[PDB]
């Protein structure tokens, strides 16, 4: 894994020692080359994981996420170029360094073979994200959003640290391979119940769960474009990755303990999709849609069936791409009109035609038009839940309908109608923004042709 | 209440100074080379070369190997009259029941 890690680390000295003109160019070029290197990890032996070393391993679950992060870094730099132009060279380099540290931490989290190291790196991501949000946000609420994000995540995580240390003491090892191979069943005792809660709750917080999702809207709304992109695409997926990894330890109690979170996620998906219908801010609407899709992912993980896990992996990747693209599309309008109110900018299809097509494709993926990977994941999850209970179809179908409604309502309001007369600052879309949208869309559409890559280990 | 500079006007359009801005910077040369770097190293290299690399990635998932083994097993079992799939994953004798 050092083939990827070491170059990512060298990205920092290059960025710091690069000329003021050339920071973005060098960062983008070398990040893209690193992403190209990451594509080698997609080749996964079916039976066994790629155990590169004692510290690091990759499987059919970690590989797609690593590729996603490496891909995301250059898109994040491209998106963040515009609003950081006025910033001084040192601050721009610090922002790029925060992004690079975040990528390094995420890669090590995904490839780490020990749960304690995974915890250290997974919590470590808070610092760069917190710094980004609270230093390069454009609103007074960036500080409160940072406090909420940090404290929600830490309150979830710390009991996880206690539980992991206890597991290390009892089983004797926190290496995932040994844990999987031995994996003695849990007993239905209050102590084991609370251990299950401690293990699950941190990832339940990271993956916005209904009742623990309040941090996500504030953080995504108040964060800069790059921070929103990472939070939606990758940081949420850390919870899913950990929950899929951690579920091995808690085999039997999961059936008994799943019902509260299963019900919360299933009803919350409807609740948040309905929330999206009446939201007045584009970023907030995108965030709530993210919440709903991650609720679908949570249901898939809790059910603990192979098809559900494959759907969860596919949905994680597809949603990361789609939500990042949606945030970037909203950010372009925000830069042009300097407001996140949906009503303020209208009829943008006439003014900016190609951005309208980008919006259409992003919304279609959001509403799971087949054969999109979004639909593949959602359909697999839906079938697994149908096996879990035939009555599940009602809520899932209602959620599908509400998702289509809110996605196309966003598209109609922002990109359709008569243009807002007074707004005169709309200017022809730059090649950079269209290139960012295309870089988002094309990999998602291409991944449909070969869907085994994003279908996870159980495939 | 304070001596603060007037809010800067909306950042000057890069088009005004350079009509073919391409974005990516104020200086036109860096704009062109940034666009070229992005387009080459993502579209031409990562998407096309990377997509080809994924498409022809060697089948270490053993799908064809599994299919060939299944064909052999099906032919043998049908020829010998043995059931196509045995109900017991592991041989009963080795198991010692309580």
């Amino acid at each position: 894994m050092l083939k990827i890690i070491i170059p990512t680390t060298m990205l920092l000295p290059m960025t710091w020692m690069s000329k003021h003109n050339m920071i973005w160019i060098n960062a983008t070029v070398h990040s893209l080359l690193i992403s190209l290197i990451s594509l080698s990890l997609l080749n996964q032996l079916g039976e066994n994981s790629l155990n590169f070393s004692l510290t690091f391993f990759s499987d059919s679950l970690s590989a797609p996420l690593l590729v996603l992060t490496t891909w995301l870094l250059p898109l994040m730099l491209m998106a963040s170029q515009s609003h950081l132009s006025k910033e001084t060279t040192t601050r721009k380099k610090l922002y790029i360094t925060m992004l690079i540290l975040l990528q390094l931490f995420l890669i090590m989290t995904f490839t780490a073979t020990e749960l304690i190291l995974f915890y250290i790196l997974f919590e470590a991501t808070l610092v760069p994200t917190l710094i980004i949000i609270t230093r390069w946000g454009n609103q007074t609420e960036r500080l409160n959003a940072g406090l909420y994000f940090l404290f929600y995540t830490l309150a979830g995580s710390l009991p996880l640290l206690v539980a992991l240390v206890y597991i290390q003491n009892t089983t004797g090892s926190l290496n995932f391979l040994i844990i999987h191979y031995w994996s003695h069943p849990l007993s239905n005792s209050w102590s084991n119940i609370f251990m299950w809660l401690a293990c699950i709750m941190a990832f339940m917080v990271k993956m916005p769960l209904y009742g623990l999702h309040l941090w996500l809207p504030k953080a995504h709304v108040e964060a800069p474009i790059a921070g929103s992109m990472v939070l939606a695409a990758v940081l949420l997926k850390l919870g899913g990755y950990g929950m899929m990894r951690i579920t091995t330890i808690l085999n039997p109690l999961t059936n008994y303990m799943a019902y509260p979170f299963l019900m919360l996620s299933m009803w919350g998906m409807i609740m948040t999709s309905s929330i999206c219908l009446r939201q007045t801010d584009l970023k907030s609407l995108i965030a709530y849609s993210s919440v709903s899709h991650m609720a679908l992912v949570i249901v898939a993980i809790m059910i603990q069936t192979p098809w559900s896990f494959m759907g969860a992996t596919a949905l994680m990747i597809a949603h990361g791409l789609t939500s990042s693209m949606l945030f970037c599309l909203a950010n372009t309008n925000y830069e042009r009109v300097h407001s996140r109110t949906m009503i303020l900018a209208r009829g943008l299809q006439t003014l900016l035609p190609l951005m309208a097509t980008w919006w259409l494709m992003a919304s279609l993926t959001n509403l799971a038009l087949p054969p999109s990977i979004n639909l593949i994941g959602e359909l697999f999850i839906i079938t697994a839940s149908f096996s879990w209970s035939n009555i599940t179809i009602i809520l899932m179908g209602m959620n599908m309908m509400i998702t289509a409604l809110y996605s196309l309502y966003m598209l109609i309001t922002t990109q359709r109608g008569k243009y807002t007369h007074h707004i005169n600052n709309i200017k022809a879309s730059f090649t950079r923004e269209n290139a960012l949208m295309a870089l988002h869309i094309l990999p998602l559409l291409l991944l449909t042709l070969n869907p085994k890559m994003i279908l996870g280990p159980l495939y | 209440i304070r001596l603060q500079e007037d809010p800067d006007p909306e950042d000057e359009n890069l088009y005004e100074k350079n009509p073919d801005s391409h974005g990516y910077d104020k200086d036109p040369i860096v704009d062109l080379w940034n666009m070229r770097v992005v387009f080459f190293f993502g579209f031409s290299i990562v998407l096309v070369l990377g997509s080809t690399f994924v498409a022809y990635l060697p089948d270490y998932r053993m799908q064809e190997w599994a299919r060939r083994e299944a064909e052999r097993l099906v032919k043998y079992r049908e020829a010998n009259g043995l059931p196509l799939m045995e109900s017991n994953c592991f041989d009963p004798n080795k198991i010692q029941l309580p």
Partner: peptide, 14 residues
Amino acid sequence: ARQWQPDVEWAEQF
């Protein structure tokens, strides 16, 4: 528009 930075009223609360 520019990133909001603390005002005198915000500072006085501390």
